[PDB]
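COMPLEX REQUEST
Ligand: magnesium ion
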Amino acid sequence: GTRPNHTIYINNLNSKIKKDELKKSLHAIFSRFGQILDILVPRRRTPRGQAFVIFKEVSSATNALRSMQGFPFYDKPMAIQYAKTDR
RNA sequence: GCAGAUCUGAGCCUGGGAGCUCUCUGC
Ligand SMILES: [Mg+2]
Ligand SMILES: [Mg+2]
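STATUS: Structure written out below.
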């Protein structure tokens, strides 16, 4: 179970992309919904196509989730959820 | 300790990946 907050968690991402390019791409797509504070691509033992996007306002996160839910991104559909704990 | 680093460092856990530890670099 989750509830809305500033951050959104995205998995099922193209792991063949460089971490740098993935950040710049996510910023260009999601910044349309509002102001972004930071994008976090954590380092894991294996590439698992995970990323976080932290907006300044929750409204930006709610609209970003609904809109890009399942929308293609680098030939793969995005699975988006809310973050467990606020950032 | 903070920050970063492996489809281009590594051992585990998991076996339907929001997990643990180590190592390297900078401070
Ligand atoms: Mg597995
Ligand atoms: Mg050290």
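REMARKS: The longest strand of chain A covers residues 7-11. Residues 9, 11, 15-16, 42-48, 50, 52, 81, 83-84 of chain A lie near RNA strand B (CB under 10 Å from a C1').
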